Structure 1
Amino acid sequence: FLGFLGAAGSTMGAASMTLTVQARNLLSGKLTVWGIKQLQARVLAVERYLRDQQLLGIWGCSGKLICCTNVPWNSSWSNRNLSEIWDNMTWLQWDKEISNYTQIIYGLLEESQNQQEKNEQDLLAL
């Protein structure tokens, strides 16, 4: 047990096993100067948790940490293979590499889930 955020130096294949310890320590895990701003910080933390939970729920990955989608991986985003991404890079190095192409993926996932829900509703009628 390394602790909170202690797997940041390890590779992303080994840091993918400890998502619960990072996910658990979010969401909390005038008469005085220290009164208003701590309430504002708590409300900001609640909002920042709820926006990420909504963004997970739009893609259809609600209630789970590792979610498999059906969007193919474009070669323009990266050209590295699976043998060295998960065994030579960390999450911090990987985040700086696909930072310019995250909105395209964030739109493709929600359009794929909307198409999947439409196809499910069309299939359940027959």
Structure 2
Amino acid sequence: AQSRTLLAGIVQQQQQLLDVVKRQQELLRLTVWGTKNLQTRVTAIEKYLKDQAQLNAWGAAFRQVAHTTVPWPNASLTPKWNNETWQEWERKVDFLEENITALLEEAQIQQEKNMYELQKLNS
């Protein structure tokens, strides 16, 4: 009179939920790539911003043998405050990622065991 058939469905439902959770993990990685990719473009833009500062006044002098160049900084480069804070951000993802992998590995071992034990009841 045991509801093993019902347990088989419940145990299977957990497996399907585990698979979807894993998919979210891979989808999250794709989103992280887009954000980082934008930063690479930003670095290229700072460089061009610097080139402007070089552009100030050309030929602004026809009775002098000199050219005035004023390369005043344009892109505010972050050396420490963002870098140190950004490293912390990347690291937290690393600890959470490692933790999720540990739980997933345990769920797989346990999920297989739950199913293996179920087979023994009706093997």
Name the one with the larger helix percent.
2
- Alignment TM-score, normalising by the size of structure 2: 0.31
Whose relative contact order is higher, 1 or 2, with alpha carbons under 8 Å and at least 6 apart? Answer: 1
Answer 1 or 2: which has greater strand percent.
Answer: 1
